[PDB]
């Protein structure tokens, strides 16, 4: 998942050529990002590739990919019934990181493939504005829990022997 900044203009009779369209598209690459941009223009402004010119498709990188932020995503998806608007919250350090969580979560809980979800907007909210029942328990200052039933960790695949010697034990870590 990568975020892109795309701009274009329309040169025809219907649209004046002094209006520049901007957008921020999340896509695995710039080819997919352009496709999401062109369809957004065509379904909302009657602008087609054969009558428009692309200008910029530069990527957007996270400014500080070391600060943990609570992201809020406003999206709309299509189910068997109809089309719904949802708002989910995730804790990650990058904008493209949270969108990766959103796509995996939606395809699991709602069984919705990626080609039914449109991401309207993604923002950042405060600590106390997280209403996710599970995620509300980690936004505090004094979160603490022991990870029990740890499986012993292997440094690398080199020591991954099929049959071991002696008894086996978990870890309280």
């Amino acid at each position: 998942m990568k975020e892109y900044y795309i701009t274009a203009r329309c040169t025809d009779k219907a649209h004046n050529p002094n209006e520049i369209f901007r957008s921020r598209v999340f896509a695995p690459n710039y080819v997919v990002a352009k496709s999401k941009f062109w369809m957004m223009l065509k379904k909302q402004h009657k602008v087609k590739k054969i009558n428009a010119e692309l200008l910029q498709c530069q990527p957007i990188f996270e400014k500080n990919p070391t600060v943990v932020k609570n992201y809020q995503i406003f999206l709309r998806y299509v189910s068997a019934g109809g089309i719904h608007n949802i708002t989910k919250q995730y804790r990650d350090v990058t904008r493209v990181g949270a969108v990766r969580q959103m796509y995996n979560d939606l395809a699991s809980q709602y069984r919705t493939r990626q080609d039914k979800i449109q991401l309207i907007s993604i923002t950042t909210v405060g600590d106390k504005a997280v209403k996710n029942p599970v995620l509300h328990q980690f936004v505090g200052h004094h979160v603490k829990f022991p990870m029990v039933h740890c499986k012993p960790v292997i440094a690398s695949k080199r020591f991954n022997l099929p049959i071991k010697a002696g008894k086996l034990t978990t870890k309280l870590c």
């Binding site: 029942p133 599970v134 328990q137 980690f138 979160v143 829990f145 022991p146 029990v148």
Partner: protein, 193 residues
């Protein structure tokens, strides 16, 4: 949703001694001992000192702790806390279950062994079959008045089941139970002391 931490506690009175060995709680009180096992693989039982009154001091408690876990598993924390609370009450003020015999026409005679470890229900609805109903270990039957008995013991689970075994043995069959109101019924459950 999954709760990050669910916890419960039970206050230990003075005349009660509690020791724990791998989710196995033994409670010793003035009336005796009571050993029970709690084999839930996701519950941690340990005794600590806690302040439970809003403005009270520290006191000895047993802490039942379950970390990250769904609502199906989390419900076992208050179940185990109730069991330990019941055991503490059982060895301090034991339980007694008073049952009353109800008949319409045929009188029912209860024959209790000398040791109190067994009963005998005779002429229930005129039946020639005599019901025995054995009693669990630590539960003793006695006759309070006419058509009334009570079961004494330290374990609520043993006393309650033994009382229900008496009632279950005297069920009317192939008859209108709304008309044939017969049998032995638990009038009330209370503490000895």
């Amino acid at each position: 949703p999954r709760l990050l931490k669910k916890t419960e506690h039970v206050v230990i009175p003075e005349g009660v001694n509690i020791e724990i060995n791998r989710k196995n709680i033994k409670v010793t009180g003035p009336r005796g001992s009571l050993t029970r096992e709690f084999q839930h693989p996701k519950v941690d039982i340990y005794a600590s000192k806690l302040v439970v009154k809003k403005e009270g001091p520290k006191e000895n408690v047993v802490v039942i702790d379950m970390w990250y876990g769904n609502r199906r598993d989390s419900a076992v924390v208050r179940t185990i806390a109730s069991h330990i609370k019941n055991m503490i009450t059982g060895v301090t003020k034991g339980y007694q279950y008073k049952m009353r015999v109800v008949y319409a026409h045929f009188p029912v005679t209860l024959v209790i062994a000398d040791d109190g470890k067994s009963i005998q229900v005779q002429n229930f609805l005129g039946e020639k079959r005599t019901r025995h109903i054995e009693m669990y270990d630590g539960v003793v039957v006695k006759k309070l008045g006419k058509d009334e008995i009570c079961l004494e013991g330290n374990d609520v689970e043993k006393v309650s089941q033994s009382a229900a075994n008496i009632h279950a043995a005297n069920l009317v069959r192939n008859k209108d139970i709304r008309q044939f109101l017969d049998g032995v019924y638990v009038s009330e459950k209370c503490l000895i002391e």
